[PDB]
Amino acid sequence: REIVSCQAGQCGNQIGSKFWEVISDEHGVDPTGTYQGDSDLQLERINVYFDESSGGRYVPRAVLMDLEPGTMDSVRAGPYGQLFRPDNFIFGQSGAGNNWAKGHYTEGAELIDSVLDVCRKEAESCDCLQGFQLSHSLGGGTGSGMGTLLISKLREEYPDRIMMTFSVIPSPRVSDTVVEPYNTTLSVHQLVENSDESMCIDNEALYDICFRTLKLTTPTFGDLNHLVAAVMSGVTCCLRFPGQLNSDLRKLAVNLVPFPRLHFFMMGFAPLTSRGSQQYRGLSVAELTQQMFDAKNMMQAADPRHGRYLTASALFRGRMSTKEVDEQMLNVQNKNSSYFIEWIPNNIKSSICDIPPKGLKMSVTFIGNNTCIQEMFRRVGEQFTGMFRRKAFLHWYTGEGMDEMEFTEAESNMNDLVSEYQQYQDATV
């Protein structure tokens, strides 16, 4: 059960590179590739993410992809950047120009052939591949434009394998471009159709967690990236380590996806506390449940209080008993039953892994398929229609071979997804 990962774009490249940093840290992998872990369990299932070489070096099973060449150099300059395989570093002469059209049709296509070549080369080495993981941002040009085409062709070639993607959804009040709605609208329907499960990252929520949950003065992209990497590694905790109640990617997808359209999830991690209150807080699984279900602790910037829960998934890590890993879920269920869908009794899937994350005695990751994900796309569609009404910033996309009909169909697809979430929000037994 080997997951093979890919990181697209600048945001995707950094997020994946430090994700590999975290995976190496928890598996006891020296940035130089050697193994220094003190536990046999780290090497027991290291083949899920790492491949051993002739000299014993553990190379990540990752594909680093972006049209800009400078991001490869930056990632290699990263402290663990020497770990990745050099031939996996695939890049274009010219960047996407932050254009979905350039990243998806003209420049991305001429290099997606090599992307698929290296992806298949890494996939064939696995005896029984579990799936493809992708990390990218939908506001960028090459992370979204070419990443969605990658997801589409991997869906075409490997239908049964689990397709997980981490989409960093852009947003207005932290926006740093003018074509986030264009790229996001052009990417959402590919994410809907060609991905088993697409989980969202929002910069306001990561930054808010940094300000108030972590109480650190100057959050960086590194800090938000660490926050997302925590749950990124925690989602495969049962895959990589034993536990009382094991699980895997397809089991989570089955327990979280009632209908194929509904596969957009929130994010969640606990515990998260400031350095000054690390020893004052009494770490317990009940407190973990409380923080995990707290709205602010979500690292997606959409309030769960405004919607209803299709399903939730709680991947707990650390030595624990079953009392407050099931009774706590029951308690939150029957105490916030107004926030949970009636026709899906006990919306919460609970899984337990014995190995806790390094530096923490106990932890938990949250995957929530709430109906409030439609608030992701309300504002995105409003901004997209605002730009599209006067046909602005569209000549860039149309000069690369894209038609206005595709933009209209993207509007229709986002509206369909929003209505699909709304109907199950207000659906009654």
Partner: peptide, 25 residues
């Protein structure tokens, strides 16, 4: 930092050999 599994911690080689032979005598 203890990485022992729950199977290991609860499932241990259990010895029934007498610790105190004075009571046996």
């Amino acid at each position: 930092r203890d990485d022992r599994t729950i199977y290991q911690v609860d499932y241990t080689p259990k010895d029934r050999s007498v610790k105190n032979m004075a009571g046996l005598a």
